[PDB]
Design a binder for this molecule. Structure first.
Ligand SMILES: [Cl-]
Ligand SMILES: [Cl-]
Lengths: 322, 321, 322, 322, 320, 320
């Protein structure tokens, strides 16, 4: 089954372990972006994927396109426009010192794009699932409205809608995010959202124990919720457990202890891609949460945004756990 | 003798020798900017310098400021504002393949700045020379008009004005630049301008042999012109010779053959700083052009934007070859 | 215009400049191979390409496959078989000291392969040119035989044949190579071959000034020959000039001086790809040889096997010299 | 408020993780020195600092000076003389293998210096605290007596005295050290001393649980002691807890678990500088000890000798652990 | 006391921490091999060592030889032949991700060797201990029979036989290996072998508790058994404890917690060499097991196959 | 034929190309020293060599020793003593910018040595040639006198004396040097010296054209002189030609243009070892000067102090 996604690619520029911005003489490059990571990760698990996106017509934009080709993501729907690819700087963290990020994504070709450049019948042909996150819709009114527009056209073709809340304080205030999420949520089939999202965006009280049930109660259209519970002990030591709620039941993976941590970035996108894989493969929910959590766990040992492992490697690891 | 400059600092991100953008997995970092480079270079030669500039209040902007501290450039007139430090990417060149650049300087804190945040009584106190380049005035109407205002105030106080043409095609059209240069040129004392500048912006004829003389006729206020003549044989082999015109005569250094080339970036800025150093030390024109060309030559052997050598090292090389 | 090729992919393991094997602590990796480099270089110039080849079903085989995806070479006709990817070690050379190689390509999946795993009608569907080199047919009788079949099949379909003599002493002795070449030569349209080839394989006396006219006389079928004239001054200083002969006239490029030299490997494949490009573009001879020599010259400035430049970048450089 | 310090700068030359001296092909460089590190760290926190020190008038000595500039420590009192900058080699440690050091600091300019080249009225002008360590006074009888002469001039002018025991087996015998310490301690206001110090140098029975109270009885002039309690589990796993004793009370921070460890070097200097910052800002004991332990903890995540964090970053971290 | 060994050297090509094969642009080089590592590690502890082995006459073969010179192993019995040095690729593991290997050792000079190029009275001259492992004998029948001949001759001379089982499933079948081990075990004095070995090759039921006693009973010729008990929590966290059995008593070290892990490769070879060192120095069994476990644990902190520490350093750590 | 040398090993710490001291964050390590380089280079050409030297008993001293083991130089005559290994820093040079050096060799274990810790009969056993340079004798009166003492014992045993003037202004003034050279020269068989040496230390006038003949006249015991003529165009472009004088003739190699230059350090030592190799192999002078000049030329392409090429590789290059 084929999947389409919508999202911005960024170049991440990272310091080496133990080196602060103020002492760095070189930066490691990684191409990534929430939705693009999900496309790459899905393609790793055998799903043909495609992404509607925008890059500048320069060598840096071309690196982003090359990243897609390398991981076999269809680039037919990459549009060339604007003046720059967005970037961010990441200062490595270890032990007591948390990673630190400086964004430089504003004014990017994507963020500034205001032109309807996609033939929807074409973008959506043969597609089973459409995936997008709250990062994209936060970038601008044009993007919020474009995404809704595309969601609706997809729903009319019976395409399933996957939505990753992915709230980023750095991108918008809780109230604006909330207004926007309330326009998307009634249109979603599969939703990545956790307890914090429940309280901030679903009017759920911090008090309620079964928040997934109350989230479904508010938006009965949502068949399935998925997220990880992360316990941050330090920048080098997390506990990680997958949750997947559907049909009135929460299914949980085993809890993994991850230490040390090579690179947590994209850990969430690995999880998301792995859940969608299980759904598309029509697995039982226990099988899906177990596989997806193993995938996200393994991603933490790999520098860069995307998860390099094939399905067999992930499955084998999930089976050793039990 | 103190020198003040005005300009934007950029972070350069470079590939390693022989590696194209498409295969690079890491980029080397260097902080620089034409006027900032001149400031640093002058500091290395014993001149207290300061710079009026703008950076974001984030760790990346802090990197630019720390670069100034490291090289003993006064930072009291650095202004924090905006959301980003401008950058550019540089793909290494060697042999037949020229270096290649991709700018990402737009929307920088400096470029977007529209606020008069400099106390001029303070900025210009104790100052002997003010230096600025054509890159700064190409960025916006505000910077063009801001530099003009500081210039006029500067002259009022008997401060000498050093102006580096530094036309960049990727910043503006010849016509726009021409109009702007026409506002600055009448205010300049020491001008870094070459043969293509004379044709381009001085309305000088292409045929004319004594361009410096004719440029001076056009703007009699300009006491001295300085440039290098670069012969580009390959990305790894240049010939370099310094020119310095004043009082009706061109003075020229010996011609250096530079090969291979480690990093030509900031080579012009090393020249510019070394010329200014000579003027400030009241050297003769022959001593100055000689010293400055040696400085520029040595810079080509050093990765990054600034010239690491002290006067003695530069002078010993110049007197050597 | 599509091109298909046949050839082995190797992993090159290279020392850094000034570091001999005996002092090296790390080796840089590059994937490459004469035909694959031509494929990749043609793709860089806008020609859809595909390649018939063999790699093991392991992570190292996979790296060769990923190399192809990265550069948009079709991999549908990559076959997975055998036990190892061929490799070779390269010790960098500078100034008086020449580069030095230790091959480790024996027993590669490609070299060992004895199975007819290609559907010829699929492989040649929509193909305007078939390219292959002396390396491939030297590897075994199976490969010589396979190349012959495929050419005869291509020839019947109106497909042009491109052939790189690419004689390698390490792979076979003159006598064997010559008998092999004598089967292919009457079937070639475009031929990369130089004076040593003429003397070695075209039966031409070394006393003949115009060897190209004589080689053409031996084989009136070959519509053009191409090659570079390399003057080795040192490991860091070469002169390079392109030749292209067709219809009774040798056309020459300017002679470039190349110093220093970053990486000469694949310079010949850059030249080949560029010449084929000019042919498929139906350019004039003087334009082609000018373009292709610039391409090959620029390639010397880039680590690894393939030429990273686009057409406009090469053509801009070619037009600067004169 | 302004601080003066006295001490030698060293160039540290470090192997990479997991690489022993016998296999290293490059060494990473860091400039440091107990007192110099304290100066840099104070300056990070807003305190103008200056340092009386000696370096050779050569490019290596210059690196030491440029390190001071970069971190805005006043260099007006750096004296150029002698033949060499002291160095030491540090072999990385991880897990069971402890870091290993080899000093190459004898015969340095600082070590051999015998000249009184500092105008004291200028050196002590506008100063509130003078800081020095047992490292400096161990280097020579000249430095021992020079530090004594300065502290005495300082004390006349109403300046507080900060002393860091910092006993080094490598530098001297306990008894000689003991005798030197007996000259300094009666003269100190703020002492960095642990229980090891208490037993070895303050003649406090190792039975004694409240060693600070006994140390105070011995030296009633000492207003407050400070130190970290370090529990070494391995070279990659330490527990760290700050202690600060003043007017009859010991005040503790939370105990931090640090793992892995990036670079413990200079962690004590980060603690020392943080404590002094708190003393200078007139914070309460519990504030200072909490802030300083956090500063020291974070330093462990950074390669090199100095702490790169600003006050807000440190304060925010400290506030999160509560 | 001098030690001789027999074994193949391989070049290991490794990715850096956190980098998969698919993204690596360079590979770090390490020379090693089970028996070659034991030889180097013994030399580190003051024992003159030598190794019977085969490398190609090319620059890569030469790297293997210079590795031996660097570490003062005698190379008089290195033979040059064949076409290639065997290699393998190692993809780093950290935390949940286990390291992974791709072997490229087949058709190696050592593997394809069929020529008896060693003067045995010279190779064994002045030697106190002969060491070899299950890796060598698995490579070819030629090597199996070569090793047997050499053990036979070594025994006539009063030379002690050290054997490391080192079963590698990739090299041969359980049944094929069982039959080789049966010809060797009756000839062994010091044996590196664990509970899995006891069940797989000594025909002991997985039931028996005191497996070493049962192993001794099967082969009363074996004076000492040694092995580590390793508990893998993750790729970055192992527990490690040494065992040494002799005269009907097992002797155990303290259990070490190792984390993170820099490079576990050659950890067992470090253990083997240190045990042999203790035996040759005539230490008590408790000193030996404690010393060798310390040695093995420290090796985990060092990139590469060999243990760079001297006796004093290892001994100081064991005592602290 | 075996060779003994006497000299100090230094650790060289270098910046990478285009990086000045002021911006470097790491330094590359190379072990070397004029005489130690000669010993290593001779070993590469098949001669068993040994070196009398001193290093500290610490891990840095050990790196110097491991360097010798790796290149098969005998270390039985390395003595451990004192507090530090000498070092120097080298700032890379390219094109117009010459490399720049800062020495940190004073107070080294070797520099400060004052104890006769060598059994001369053992040091010289089996030796055909003894080599030393003006660097060693300049370090202290102890080393000057110790070098003479060893030379004399060597001559009593028919050993040939190879001396490399190698005057270094950093180490001593011309007068003191000349004094010392005047004790050594009457004892030398093979001498590395050029025209500047002739004027400076042989008291030849800068008028004489045939300076070697005049130098021989003064010291007829000197069978042959050898040196390179270097023309420095830039830090990345040198011309190099070898000279070799014997039996009243100067033999010159072809002239090599070297560009770019990877690392000139040890270039002279490569020349010296290759010349000695030719002498020991009893080659004709034209064969020797051609081979040695090629050796020295190839060295310029290799990072570090020592020449990695074998004889066949150098000979093949010379023949082109
Ligand atoms: Cl770690
Ligand atoms: Cl170069």
């Amino acid at each position: 089954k084929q999947v389409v996604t919508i999202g911005e690619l960024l170049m991440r520029l990272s310091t080496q372990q133990g080196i602060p911005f103020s002492q760095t003489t070189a930066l490691d490059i990684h191409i990534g972006g929430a939705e693009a990571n999900v496309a790459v990760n899905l393609s790793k698990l055998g799903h043909p994927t495609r992404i509607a996106t925008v890059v500048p017509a320069n060598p840096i934009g071309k690196m982003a396109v090359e990243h897609l080709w390398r991981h076999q993501v269809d680039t037919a729907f990459v549009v060339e426009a604007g003046d720059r690819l967005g970037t961010y700087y990441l200062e490595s963290g270890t032990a007591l010192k948390a990673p630190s990020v400086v964004y430089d994504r504003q004014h990017s070709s994507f963020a500034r794009h205001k032109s309807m450049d996609w033939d929807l019948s074409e973008l959506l042909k043969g597609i089973r699932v459409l995936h997008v996150s709250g990062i994209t819709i936060a970038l601008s009114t044009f993007w919020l409205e474009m995404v809704v527009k595309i969601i609706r056209e997809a729903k009319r073709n019976g395409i399933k809608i996957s939505f990753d809340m992915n709230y980023r304080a750095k991108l918008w205030e809780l109230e604006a995010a909330k207004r926007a999420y309330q326009q998307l949520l009634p249109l979603v089939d599969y939703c990545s959202a956790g307890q914090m999202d429940a309280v901030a965006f679903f009017e759920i009280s911090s008090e309620t124990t079964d928040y997934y049930q109350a989230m479904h109660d508010k938006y009965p259209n949502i068949e399935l919720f998925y997220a990880t519970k992360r316990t941050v002990i330090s920048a080098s030591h997390h506990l990680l457990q997958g949750h997947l709620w559907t049909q009135g039941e929460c299914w949980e993976s085993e809890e993994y202890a991850i230490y040390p941590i090579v690179d947590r970035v994209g850990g969430g996108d690995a999880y998301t891609a792995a859940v969608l894989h299980g759904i598309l493969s029509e697995w039982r929910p226990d099988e899906t949460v177990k596989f997806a959590t193993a995938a996200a766990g393994l991603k933490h040992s790999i520098h860069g945004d995307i998860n390099p492992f094939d399905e067999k490697t992930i499955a084998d690891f999930a089976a050793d756990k039990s």
